[PDB]
């Protein structure tokens, strides 16, 4: 029966799977809140440049 399967069509025993990429999760990168507050100057120290 197995040989008859193969004689009919190889996809009966070993089908061609669709090749696909691996997908990784994003590299989560922790940082402090202050890091984003850098370069933020008080509005009482910024002139109308």
């Amino acid at each position: 029966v197995r040989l008859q399967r193969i004689c009919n069509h190889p996809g009966l025993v070993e089908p061609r799977h669709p090749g696909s990429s691996y997908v990784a999760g994003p590299l989560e990168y922790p940082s402090a809140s202050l890091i984003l507050k850098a370069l933020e100057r008080d509005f009482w120290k910024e002139a109308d440049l």
Binding site: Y29, A32, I35, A38, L39
Partner: protein
């Protein structure tokens, strides 16, 4: 737990400097052997780093090839706490096609100084009981509570489908909800206050604030010549954080292995870079004697100009004796799980003294493989002789290249 990413390298056996509380170096401790004076000096430098009060201190490790300079540096990295940054680069790595040499050295310096920021946040973690849209009911194994939902929190719970029976955690200040499964239910308090401590290098701050989504440049590279104004503004903001107490500065180490590959421009930059108050402790290694400085015709005691050599303290590494070489071979064998007979140890020590230490270290693995092939259990002299026959050292290879000089290309 098989075939981890970290495998047995050249400096895997080194776990520290092997020093006492008086910085007296033990003859064999934490993988280190001999180099007593240089290990004591490395320990003094390590204490300097840990104190972190003085900025811009430079130390050069100098000696013959194989005298354990990179080993000393790796030991200092291992002994130094993982919290404190330790940037280790080769001297050829500053020749980037994406940034100038001075910019690469600047980034390396700023990668070696860390800003430690502590902040508290409130985290809610529990099991969902009932959700009405708004009202939210959460329970733990010890307590249950019902919360009145806001418009933004209702939107957050609507975007991420949350239903009864799910176990989720919510950041109270931001509403960040992540589902971790369905129901073990959390045991303790539903609402907890957690301090979190991040150490962010000055370079990470610079790049994060360089541009929109600038943190991507911390991973892929792509960081151009960061503007000097941004760096100055960040230096001032970091000083303000230190004054206000919002952050602490953790000075680290920049290690430039084989610094002799730097050019006169890089050395001139290093002359002034070590004079800033945010300069880290610089450690260098070089085997060059009096030799020409790259980019100039001038010869210098280490390929480093005497301007920079005047800004640094030099640590010399001696040759090893027979006992130290044998002990290093023993520690490498223990690291690689190789059992050798005493006569094999003597033969390998003789080979290491005669030809090279690295050659003996490589012959350790070669002899182990040859012994495994013959169904052996302990490496014998026959295996050391076999691997000595199969594999040549630089001296013997050179002698054979001289024997057949007519067959080689551009031989002189």
């Amino acid at each position: 737990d098989v075939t981890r990413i970290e495998r047995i390298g050249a400096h895997s056996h080194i776990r520290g400097l092997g020093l006492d509380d008086a910085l007296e170096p033990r003859q064999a401790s934490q993988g280190m052997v001999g180099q007593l004076a240089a290990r004591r000096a490395a320990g003094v430098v390590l204490e300097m780093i840990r104190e972190g009060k003085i900025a811009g201190r430079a130390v050069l490790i100098a000696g013959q090839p194989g005298t354990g300079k990179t080993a000393i540096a790796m030991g200092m990295a291992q002994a130094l706490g993982p919290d404190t940054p330790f940037t280790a680069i080769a001297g050829s790595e500053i020749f980037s096609l994406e940034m100038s040499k001075t910019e690469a050295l600047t980034q390396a310096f700023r990668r070696s100084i860390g800003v430690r920021i502590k902040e508290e946040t409130e985290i809610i973690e529990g099991e969902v009981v009932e959700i009405q849209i708004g009202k939210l009911t959460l329970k733990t194994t010890e307590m249950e509570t019902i919360y009145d939902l806001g418009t933004k929190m209702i939107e957050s719970l609507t975007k991420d489908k949350v239903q009864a029976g799910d176990v989720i955690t919510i950041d109270k200040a931001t509403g960040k909800i992540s589902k971790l499964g369905r129901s073990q239910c959390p045991d303790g308090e539903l609402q907890k206050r957690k301090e979190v401590v991040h150490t962010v290098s000055l370079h990470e701050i610079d790049v994060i604030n360089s541009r929109t989504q600038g943190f991507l440049a911390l991973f892929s590279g792509d960081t151009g010549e960061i503007k000097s104004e941004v760096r100055e503004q960040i230096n001032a903001k970091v000083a303000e954080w230190r004054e206000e107490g919002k952050a602490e500065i953790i000075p680290g180490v920049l290690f430039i292995d084989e610094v002799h590959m730097l050019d006169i421009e890089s050395f001139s930059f290093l002359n002034r870079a070590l004079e800033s108050d945010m300069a880290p402790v610089l450690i260098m290694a070089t085997n060059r004697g009096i030799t020409r400085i790259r980019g100039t015709s001038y010869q210098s005691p280490h390929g480093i100009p005497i301007d920079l050599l005047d800004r640094l303290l030099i640590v010399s590494t001696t040759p090893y004796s027979e006992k130290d070489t044998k002990q290093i071979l023993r520690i490498r064998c223990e690291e690689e799980d190789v059992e050798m007979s005493e006569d094999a140890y003597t033969v390998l020590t003789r080979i290491g003294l005669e030809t090279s230490l690295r050659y003996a270290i490589q012959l350790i693995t070669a002899a182990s493989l040859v012994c495994r092939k013959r169904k052996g259990t302990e490496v014998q002299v026959d295996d050391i002789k076999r691997v000595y026959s199969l594999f040549l050292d630089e001296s013997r290879s050179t002698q054979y290249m001289k024997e057949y000089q007519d067959a080689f290309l551009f031989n002189e």
